[PDB]
């Protein structure tokens, strides 16, 4: 409510208090001005953050070890085009039925916040989350680190969304660098570390 | 004193303006029907800001040319203004970075400073408010956007009282005006002579009759 | 934003978006299954 | 005290009014009761008068709307340069302009439409363009797709800048009324500023980029090996080797030894014989002199100092015994009525475009333009239509001025009043001269057709019978041909190879220009032009002179500018409004321009265009058939329309087939227009009643009650489809023919 803003001296939009984690008053196009949309965009930002972080660590760490020798994992940009134990199109069907189910229940939870906290096969199992986007329970917060004081939950979720935002620019950078340069990300960083003033986005 | 003033320019230029010579043959700072960037408060700021950069430029665009001809900086770093990489077809030089990579660092650093500076013109009380490495203690301005002062911009305490500040503002203004004409001088002398400004100053002493604006 | 969403719903705007989507669909059916005279 | 006067934040920027259709109008804003609402919303969108009566607030709307138009043009030019850069054979065309067909559009492969990608040369497949952009870019010294890419980005930037300015000068800093009325400052800034600094700065490009690069192209060196344009600025010796005047630099300019520049500033005339276009050294010298004239002309009117006139003084000082007070009061009219300004500007801009049509064909200003018969037939026709439309627009806003802005009590003018006091003498005289013209032009054709049908070709108006030689035009032709040695000593050759005399210029075995002969047939078709133009002025001028009143309708001005009629009484008063005169004048403008462009197409194919032999035996496209064929209507039916329509009706199955489809499509739209022009909304409203009943029977009637188009809309819809179908038919007929045989 008196927090640092993405634009010091500017005035934050009325729909952004500071009660949301990662609230820095940035929405110059009013994409979240309607409260119904702002709640949907929070959930969309949360899942974009969590997929980007898994994706970032899934392309930066494995490529970081193959550039050496600890791993031999192929280029992240081409790992999809190679063949596996079954064909790629069977893996995609198994992915949809498995991810669609998990996505379906998350969807139901967004539109009806308490309806899917109970295990449909063994109704003894239950999730523990109170807020949409933080399902809790044993399967997603087995340590109990998700249930804390609202002061710590504000920071912990701000750490969550900040790491997810950075990961989003990073993953999108890894996709763009691989097309403008011609190698992997670990190569780009060393090249820029070999000569910082010249080995950049300029080649001409 | 009035430099080609008129009895309509005197109606709004009340002398309460550092450098108020009454000069306005086109009625630009007329407070009747202002808007956009044609505005009295803003034009004074633009006169000052352009004046300050020209003072850095008029000296810097001739400092390596002067220091080099004497032999004070290496002859491989002493250059004329239009041959340092600013205009690649006229001259380049291998700095520690590419000529375009340097501009990104420039606009990145010049961005932060010029962006924060604009907020003291818009919201005067700002910049000192939002955290900034504790440096925000000397970013609160002064109620004057063009003369913020403080520990960062007036660290020595000049303009101590009334009669000193207005005498300082008046000299600060007239210098930028001549430096701006100097910046204007370096530009046309470059395109018409093809040589540096300090050399143009030289050949007008070695032969004033045959080295002139009329010979080119 | 709600004013913008109202404008985006006005007859001409909703028509181009609807017919654009339609044209794209029919074009791609014709790129995938061209020259269909029967059925 | 001419100064910048602006108001701060007049109109708040908000999407609130985007959500409210018809907000600008108090009637329309309440929402639709009927479908008629939908149409009035659009008919009234730009009628800024009906939105607000405040002249200041009207001017602000037209100012930002102008920025809107400029934004659209820059975006249009961005795409033209972008397609030249990305989807063209311009780079290949530079190596072989006599053979490779300009192409800058490529169709995606879908539903069989690839056939429109034609074998145009240069290893390219695309649609042959006739806008002429390739001849422009070459004359500008553009040598690569990279240069077009950068011009397209700059055009895109200017499009954004112009759009920003429109929003800026309406919502942020909107000029006050008196700022717009400072017509002295505007004229000075447009003469000296726009026209002057535009022609001067463009002359600089011609000197430092266009002249040198075209010298390498014409010498034969490959464009990839021609020095980049900035090398002629960085290194003067490159220039000096082509034109040794640059060796002395800007010194001969200030020492009045201008004759030293006679190698890149010339007065040769004629056409560069190895390129077919005007001499680029004559053109550069043209823009130079033209730029001087405008820079000084922009100093004529008085502003913030003493020198110069007040435009009111010049007007108030011209008046004669036959006119009385003369031009007094015109300065108040032309500083308070936007329609009076728009009427004059449309009149002149339209007239000027028709001149551009003539001058650009007889003095081809671009290299390898004259031999691209398809581009040149397109350019002349395109600018005729644009010119004729703008002219008819002048009559509308002249008519709109008389209904809405004319006020003899506040802004009197004795010149305007004197014409109103004898409008019956003007219109009756124009009526008679039209009847004379029609009989003594078209009637001669009917004489010829009847004589030729009866087996009596000796009694025709023909070059081989009763001859009607255009002595005066023939005389002017023979005069200009003798000007370079006599009345224009500095001129080497005539200003145009059309000037009856000289010789011939060919490019790649194709004739560019020769002397154009003017005989009996040229006499007839010229008196058709005078006839058709006279009737167009008769209808339009009558519409403005009786816009306020007539013996039939004494209070017509109270019925507005645009109204269907005043009912069946007085024997019937349909189409008394000035708007209806503009409706009728469009059909006649269409008529007049159609035979003008037909006159152009047949003459060029018959007596000018064609292929030259090894020894000089010219074979024209239609072999001189214009003289004996174009003097009967049957000759135009048979030897022009029936014969030249061959290409378009056999274009199916080839890359020209899209003209085949457009030929038939435009016939359709033209015939479709007749439904509107021949019927009346009463029939249609009753029909709709039976249809509405059927919808009610199934509970599907709309709350927006369906109405027939208004009487005026019916007419507007009619003339719009009539002109679109009519003109598009000739478009598809011209392009198919000229691309197949040119
Ligand atoms: C016969 C029709 C039918 C259809 C089309 C579906 C379709 C669906 N059910 Mg459902 N269901 C049905 C009958 C049906 N069910 C019956 C008869 C029962 C027993 C009462 C259930 C009990 C059930 C549970 C318990 C759940 C679903 C879920 C789902 C969704 C899984 C998403 C996915 O991709 O998984 C691959 C999907 C939309 C899941 C879901 O996403 O719900 C939000 C879920 O959790 N269904
Ligand atoms: C740095 C990023 C980051 C941060 C700070 C958090 C923080 C949080 N998450 Mg989150 N999450 C993230 C990334 C992150 N997550 C990613 C990438 C995913 C996708 C897999 C998820 C999926 C997820 C779910 C499904 C749930 C949470 C929950 C929580 C909350 C309690 C759990 C906790 O304390 O995590 C602490 C996290 C760390 C200390 C980071 C450890 C990182 C390394 C890689 C350990 C992983 C090891 C692995 C086996 C390899 C807390 C607000 C739960 C919640 O709110 O319950 C109420 C909950 O239900 N998150
Ligand atoms: C014909 C078009 C047109 C006209 C008549 C005006 C008229 C006006 N504008 Mg405006 N404007 C235009 C286009 C136009 N503008 C465009 C395209 C933009 C977008 C960039 C703007 C952006 C703009 C702003 C932001 C402001 C105005 C302002 C003004 C007012 C004072 C201008 C003045 O003399 O300030 C003095 C002019 C200058 C100090 C500029 C001098 C140097 C610039 C760069 C001019 C160079 C242009 C030149 C022809 C280009 C040559 C390029 C070539 C060498 C390659 C006046 C009513 C001002 C206002 O509101 O006044 C009340 C104001 O604040 N305009
Ligand atoms: C804001 C004004 C300004 C700007 C943008 C520049 C810009 C530049 N100066 Mg410079 N300079 C300036 C004012 C300025 N000067 C003034 C006022 C002085 C005198 C105190 C100098 C004295 C100076 C020297 C002695 C040298 C530069 C050099 C340079 C270049 C490299 C900068 C670098 O490495 O750090 C660059 C073109 C270097 C260079 O290569 O010269 C062009 C160099 O050796 N400058
Ligand atoms: C007068 C301007 C003009 C015109 C008539 C064309 C025409 C054409 N261009 Mg071209 N182009 C232009 C300017 C223009 N261009 C400019 C300025 C650029 C540079 C940015 C390009 C860059 C360009 C490329 C890169 C390509 C074309 C292509 C094409 C062809 C197919 C385009 C197509 O089907 O799009 C597809 C249709 C759509 C995208 C329309 C979507 C419908 C939506 C719903 C309408 C939205 C309406 C909305 C309310 C208003 C939005 C406004 C918004 C912009 C602010 C077509 C002949 C293509 C081509 O030639 O392929 C061989 C091609 O690949 N053009
Ligand atoms: C610079 C040129 C110019 C300008 C600024 C104006 C401006 C104006 N004219 Mg004017 N006019 C012009 C040229 C111009 N005209 C010309 C050249 C003609 C001769 C044709 C006319 C004939 C004319 C008449 C007869 C009338 C006006 C009217 C008006 C006013 C209202 C316009 C409006 O709201 O229309 C809104 C615009 C439309 C509804 C567009 C309709 C669509 C057009 C007709 C079809 C275009 C077809 C297109 C080229 C081909 C694409 C086909 C494709 C879609 C399949 C406005 C002041 C009206 C008035 O009452 O003034 C007060 C009026 O009745 N004008
Ligand atoms: C081909 C069809 C056609 C013809 C012949 C005419 C003819 C005429 N129109 Mg017209 N018009 C037409 C279509 C046509 N229109 C259409 C489609 C429209 C709708 C847009 C209009 C709208 C229109 C308007 C709005 C105006 C005209 C005007 C005119 C007259 C022009 C003056 C003139 O040349 O008189 C001379 C007549 C002719 C050249 C016709 C041919 C005469 C023949 C060749 C001579 C016959 C000799 C002798 C009588 C033999 C017969 C003997 C017999 C009795 C036994 C003229 C009577 C204008 C007018 O009245 O100005 C005076 C006028 O203002 N028309
Ligand atoms: C045509 C000869 C001509 O130019 O006359 C010019 C004649 C002389 O005009 P005044 O000398 O009255 O005009 C003075 C000013 O009003 C025009 O500068 O004007 C008329 O009376 C117009 C006659 C129209 C007659 C149409 C026939
Ligand atoms: C960054 C992007 C979102 C950026 C959107 C931001 C900027 C929008 C900003 C604004 O809207 C605001 C906020 C407010 C408005 O007023 C203004 C604008 C400016 C409009 C999301 C990317 C989201 C990117 C995420 C979702 C991608 C996750 C990808 C994972 C699955 C990849 C897995 C793999 O990479 C591995 C691990 C190994 C490989 O070998 C194989 C594969 C499969 C490739
Ligand atoms: C094509 C195109 C484009 C481009 C354009 C351009 C490129 C332009 C340029 C332009 C230019 C670049 C211009 C320039 C100008 C200049 C000028 C105009 C100058 C003037 C001068 C003067 C006036 C002078 C004066 C003087 C005198 C008189 C004497 C002595 C002294 C002096 C010299 C000072 C665009 C993108 C837009 C768009 C699209 C198309
Ligand atoms: C044929 C015509 C009729 C009827 C034609 C009118 C009613 C035009 C109908 C225009 C459209 C087609 C009406 C429907 C418009 C809706 C936007 C359609 C929505 C459906 C979607 C496909 C967009 C009259 O109005 C009449 C007017 C006076 C002189 C003669 C004419 C004329 O001859
Ligand atoms: S027919 Fe139509 S236009 Fe002619 S009078 Fe009757 S209503 Fe008015």
UniProtKB/TrEMBL annotation, chain A:
<feature type="binding site">
    <location>
        <position position="119"/>
    </location>
    <ligand>
        <name>chlorophyll b 8</name>
    </ligand>
</feature>
<feature type="binding site">
    <location>
        <position position="160"/>
    </location>
    <ligand>
        <name>chlorophyll a 1</name>
    </ligand>
</feature>
<comment type="function">
    <text>The light-harvesting complex (LHC) functions as a light receptor, it captures and delivers excitation energy to photosystems with which it is closely associated.</text>
</comment>
<keyword id="KW-0148">Chlorophyll</keyword>
<feature type="binding site">
    <location>
        <position position="50"/>
    </location>
    <ligand>
        <name>chlorophyll b 4</name>
    </ligand>
</feature>
<feature type="binding site">
    <location>
        <position position="136"/>
    </location>
    <ligand>
        <name>chlorophyll a 22</name>
    </ligand>
</feature>
<feature type="binding site">
    <location>
        <position position="101"/>
    </location>
    <ligand>
        <name>chlorophyll b 6</name>
    </ligand>
</feature>
<keyword id="KW-0157">Chromophore</keyword>
<feature type="binding site">
    <location>
        <position position="136"/>
    </location>
    <ligand>
        <name>chlorophyll a 10</name>
    </ligand>
</feature>
<feature type="binding site">
    <location>
        <position position="95"/>
    </location>
    <ligand>
        <name>chlorophyll a 14</name>
    </ligand>
</feature>
<feature type="binding site">
    <location>
        <position position="163"/>
    </location>
    <ligand>
        <name>chlorophyll a 1</name>
    </ligand>
</feature>
<feature type="binding site">
    <location>
        <position position="103"/>
    </location>
    <ligand>
        <name>chlorophyll a 16</name>
    </ligand>
</feature>
<feature type="binding site">
    <location>
        <position position="6"/>
    </location>
    <ligand>
        <name>chlorophyll b 1</name>
    </ligand>
</feature>
<feature type="binding site">
    <location>
        <position position="29"/>
    </location>
    <ligand>
        <name>all-trans-violaxanthin</name>
    </ligand>
</feature>
<dbReference type="GO" id="GO:0046872">
    <property type="term" value="F:metal ion binding"/>
</dbReference>
UniProtKB/TrEMBL annotation, chain C:
<keyword id="KW-1133">Transmembrane helix</keyword>
<dbReference type="GO" id="GO:0015979">
    <property type="term" value="P:photosynthesis"/>
</dbReference>
<comment type="function">
    <text>May help in the organization of the PsaE and PsaF subunits.</text>
</comment>
<feature type="binding site">
    <location>
        <position position="31"/>
    </location>
    <ligand>
        <name>chlorophyll a</name>
    </ligand>
</feature>
<dbReference type="InterPro" id="IPR002615">
    <property type="entry name" value="PSI_PsaJ"/>
</dbReference>
<feature type="transmembrane region" description="Helical">
    <location>
        <begin position="6"/>
        <end position="27"/>
    </location>
</feature>
<dbReference type="Pfam" id="PF01701">
    <property type="entry name" value="PSI_PsaJ"/>
</dbReference>
<keyword id="KW-0812">Transmembrane</keyword>
<keyword id="KW-0602">Photosynthesis</keyword>
<dbReference type="GO" id="GO:0009535">
    <property type="term" value="C:chloroplast thylakoid membrane"/>
</dbReference>
<keyword id="KW-0603">Photosystem I</keyword>
<protein>
    <recommendedName>
        <fullName>Photosystem I reaction center subunit IX</fullName>
    </recommendedName>
</protein>
<dbReference type="GO" id="GO:0009522">
    <property type="term" value="C:photosystem I"/>
</dbReference>
<keyword id="KW-0934">Plastid</keyword>
<dbReference type="InterPro" id="IPR036062">
    <property type="entry name" value="PSI_PsaJ_sf"/>
</dbReference>
Automatic annotation (TrEMBL), chain D:
<feature type="binding site">
    <location>
        <position position="170"/>
    </location>
    <ligand>
        <name>chlorophyll a 1</name>
    </ligand>
</feature>
<feature type="transmembrane region" description="Helical">
    <location>
        <begin position="523"/>
        <end position="541"/>
    </location>
</feature>
<feature type="binding site">
    <location>
        <position position="151"/>
    </location>
    <ligand>
        <name>chlorophyll a 19</name>
    </ligand>
</feature>
<feature type="binding site">
    <location>
        <position position="206"/>
    </location>
    <ligand>
        <name>chlorophyll a 24</name>
    </ligand>
</feature>
<dbReference type="InterPro" id="IPR006243">
    <property type="entry name" value="PSI_PsaA"/>
</dbReference>
<feature type="binding site">
    <location>
        <position position="185"/>
    </location>
    <ligand>
        <name>chlorophyll a 21</name>
    </ligand>
</feature>
<feature type="binding site">
    <location>
        <position position="83"/>
    </location>
    <ligand>
        <name>chlorophyll a 13</name>
    </ligand>
</feature>
<comment type="function">
    <text>PsaA and PsaB bind P700, the primary electron donor of photosystem I (PSI), as well as the electron acceptors A0, A1 and FX. PSI is a plastocyanin-ferredoxin oxidoreductase, converting photonic excitation into a charge separation, which transfers an electron from the donor P700 chlorophyll pair to the spectroscopically characterized acceptors A0, A1, FX, FA and FB in turn. Oxidized P700 is reduced on the lumenal side of the thylakoid membrane by plastocyanin.</text>
</comment>
<feature type="binding site">
    <location>
        <position position="366"/>
    </location>
    <ligand>
        <name>chlorophyll a 16</name>
    </ligand>
</feature>
<feature type="binding site">
    <location>
        <position position="69"/>
    </location>
    <ligand>
        <name>chlorophyll a 6</name>
    </ligand>
</feature>
<dbReference type="InterPro" id="IPR020586">
    <property type="entry name" value="PSI_PsaA/B_CS"/>
</dbReference>
<feature type="binding site">
    <location>
        <position position="456"/>
    </location>
    <ligand>
        <name>chlorophyll a 35</name>
    </ligand>
</feature>
<keyword id="KW-0460">Magnesium</keyword>
<feature type="binding site">
    <location>
        <position position="299"/>
    </location>
    <ligand>
        <name>chlorophyll a 23</name>
    </ligand>
</feature>
<feature type="transmembrane region" description="Helical">
    <location>
        <begin position="283"/>
        <end position="301"/>
    </location>
</feature>
């Amino acid at each position: 409510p008196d927090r640092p803003l993405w634009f010091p001296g500017s005035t934050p939009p009325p729909w952004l208090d500071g009660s949301l984690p990662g609230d820095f008053g940035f929405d110059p196009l009013g994409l979240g001005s309607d409260p119904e949309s702002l709640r949907w965009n929070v959930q969309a930002e949360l899942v974009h953050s969590r997929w980007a972080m898994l994706g970032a660590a899934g392309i930066f760490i494995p490529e970081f070890l193959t550039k050496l020798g600890i791993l031999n994992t192929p280029s992240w940009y081409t790992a999809g085009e190679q063949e596996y134990f079954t064909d790629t199109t069977t893996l995609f069907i198994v992915e949809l039925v498995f991810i669609g189910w998990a996505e379906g229940r998350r969807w139901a939870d967004i539109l009806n916040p308490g309806c899917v906290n109970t295990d449909p096969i063994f109704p003894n199992n239950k999730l523990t989350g109170t807020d949409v986007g933080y399902p809790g329970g044993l399967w997603f917060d087995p340590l109990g680190w998700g249930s804390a004081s609202p002061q710590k939950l504000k920071e912990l979720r701000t750490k969550e969304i900040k790491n997810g935002r950075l990961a989003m620019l990073a993953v999108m950078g890894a996709w763009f660098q691989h097309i403008y340069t011609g190698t992997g990300p670990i190569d780009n960083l060393f090249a820029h570390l070999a000569d910082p003033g010249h080995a950049t986005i300029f080649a001409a | 004193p009035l430099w080609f003033a008129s009895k309509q320019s005197l109606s709004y230029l009340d002398g309460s303006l550092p450098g108020d010579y009454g000069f306005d043959p086109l009625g630009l700072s007329d407070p009747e029907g202002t808007g956009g960037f044609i505005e009295p408060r803003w034009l004074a700021y633009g006169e000052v800001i352009n004046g300050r950069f020209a003072m850095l430029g008029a000296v810097g665009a001739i400092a390596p040319e002067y220091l080099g001809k004497v032999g004070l900086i290496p002859q491989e770093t002493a250059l004329a203004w239009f041959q340092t990489g600013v205009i690649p077809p006229a001259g380049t030089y291998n700095y520690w970075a590419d000529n375009y990579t340097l501009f990104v660092l420039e606009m990145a650093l010049m961005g932060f400073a010029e962006h924060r500076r604009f907020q003291d013109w818009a919201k005067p009380g700002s910049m000192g408010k939002q955290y900034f490495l504790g440096l925000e203690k000397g970013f609160g301005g002064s109620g004057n956007p063009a003369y913020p002062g403080g520990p960062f911009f007036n660290p020595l305490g000049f303009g101590k009282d009334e009669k000193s500040l207005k005498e300082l503002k008046l000299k600060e203004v007239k210098n930028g005006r001549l430096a701006m004409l100097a910046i204007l001088g370096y530009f046309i002398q470059g395109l018409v002579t093809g040589v540096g400004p300090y050399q143009n100053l030289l050949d007008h002493v070695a032969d004033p009759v045959n080295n002139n604006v009329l010979t080119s | 934003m709600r004013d913008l969403k109202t404008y985006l719903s006005v007859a001409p705007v909703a028509s181009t978006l609807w017919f654009a989507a339609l044209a794209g669909l029919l074009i791609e059916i014709n790129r995938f299954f061209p020259d269909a005279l029967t059925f | 005290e001419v100064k910048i006067l602006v108001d701060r934040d007049p109109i708040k920027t908000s999407f609130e009014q985007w959500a409210k259709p018809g907000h600008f109008s108090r009637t329309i804003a309440k929402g639709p009761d009927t479908t008629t609402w939908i149409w009035n919303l659009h008919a009234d969108a730009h009628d800024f008068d009906s939105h607000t009566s405040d002249l200041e607030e009207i001017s602000r709307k037209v100012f930002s709307a102008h920025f809107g138009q400029l934004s659209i043009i820059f975006l249009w030019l961005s795409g033209m340069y972008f397609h030249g850069a990305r989807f063209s054979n311009y780079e290949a065309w530079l190596n072989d302009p006599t053979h490779i067909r300009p192409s800058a559009q490529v169709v995606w492969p879908i539903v069989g439409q690839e056939i429109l990608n034609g074998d145009v040369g240069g290893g390219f497949r695309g649609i042959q363009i006739t806008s002429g952009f390739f001849q422009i870019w070459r004359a500008s010294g553009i040598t690569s797709e990279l240069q077009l890419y950068c011009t397209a980005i700059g055009a895109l930037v200017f499009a954004a800048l112009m759009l920003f300015a429109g929003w800026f000068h309406y919502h942020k800093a909107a000029p006050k009324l008196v700022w717009f009325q400072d017509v002295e400052s505007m004229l000075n800034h447009h003469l000296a500023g726009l026209l002057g600094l535009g022609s001067l700065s463009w002359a600089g490009h011609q000197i430092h980029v266009s002249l040198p690069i075209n010298q390498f192209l014409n010498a034969g060196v490959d464009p990839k090996e021609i020095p980049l344009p900035h090398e002629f600025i960085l290194n003067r010796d490159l220039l000096a080797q082509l034109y040794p005047s640059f060796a002395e630099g800007a010194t001969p300019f200030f020492t009045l030894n201008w004759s030293k520049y006679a190698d890149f500033l010339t007065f040769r005339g004629g056409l560069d014989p190895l390129t077919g276009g005007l001499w680029l050294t004559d053109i550069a010298h043209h823009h130079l002199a033209i730029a001087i004239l405008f820079l000084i002309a922009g100093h004529m009117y008085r502003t913030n100092w003493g020198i110069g006139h007040g435009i009111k003084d010049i007007l108030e000082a011209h008046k004669g015994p036959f006119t009385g007070q003369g031009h007094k009061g015109l300065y108040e009219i032309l500083t308070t009525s936007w329609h009076a300004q728009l009427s004059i500007n449309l009149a002149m801009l339209g007239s000027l475009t028709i001149i551009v049509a003539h001058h650009m064909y007889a003095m081809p200003p671009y290299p390898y333009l004259a031999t691209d018969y398809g581009t040149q037939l397109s350019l002349f026709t395109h600018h005729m239509w644009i010119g004729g439309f703008l002219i008819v627009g002048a009559a509308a806003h002249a008519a709109i001025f008389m209904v809405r802005d004319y006020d003899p009590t506040t802004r009197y003018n004795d010149l305007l009043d004197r014409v109103l006091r004898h409008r019956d003498a003007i219109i009756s005289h124009l009526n008679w001269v039209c009847i004379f013209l029609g009989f003594h032009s078209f009637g001669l054709y009917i004489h010829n057709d009847t004589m030729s049908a009866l087996g009596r070709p000796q009694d025709m108006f023909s070059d081989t019978a009763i001859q009607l030689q255009p002595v005066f035009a023939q005389w002017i032709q023979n005069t200009h041909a003798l000007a370079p040695g006599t009345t224009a000593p500095g001129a080497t050759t005539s200003t145009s190879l059309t000037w009856g005399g000289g010789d011939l210029v060919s490019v790649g075995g194709k004739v560019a220009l020769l002397p154009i002969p003017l005989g009996t047939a040229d006499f007839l078709v010229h008196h058709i032009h005078a006839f058709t133009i006279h009737v167009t002025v008769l209808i339009l001028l009558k519409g403005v002179l009786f816009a306020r009143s007539s013996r039939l309708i004494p209070d017509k001005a109270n019925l507005g500018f645009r109204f269907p009629c005043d009912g069946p009484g007085r024997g019937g008063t349909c189409q008394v409004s000035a708007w209806d005169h503009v409706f009728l004048g469009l059909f006649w403008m269409y008529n007049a321009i159609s035979v003008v462009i037909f006159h152009f197409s047949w003459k060029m194919q018959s007596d000018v265009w064609g292929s030259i032999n090894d020894q000089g035996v010219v074979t024209h496209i239609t072999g001189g058939n214009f003289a004996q064929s174009s003097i009967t209507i049957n000759g135009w039916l048979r030897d022009f329309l029936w014969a030249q329509a061959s290409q378009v009706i056999q274009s199916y199955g080839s890359s020209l087939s899209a003209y085949g489809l457009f030929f038939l499509g435009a016939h359709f739209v033209w015939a479709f227009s007749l439904m509107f022009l021949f019927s009346g909304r009463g029939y249609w409203q009753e029909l709709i009643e039976s249809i509405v009943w059927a919808h009610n029977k199934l509970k599907v009637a709309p709350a927006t009650q369906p109405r027939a188009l208004s009487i005026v809309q019916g007419r507007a819809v009619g003339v719009t489809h009539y002109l679109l179908g009519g003109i598009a038919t000739t478009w598809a007929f011209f392009l198919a023919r000229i691309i197949a045989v040119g």
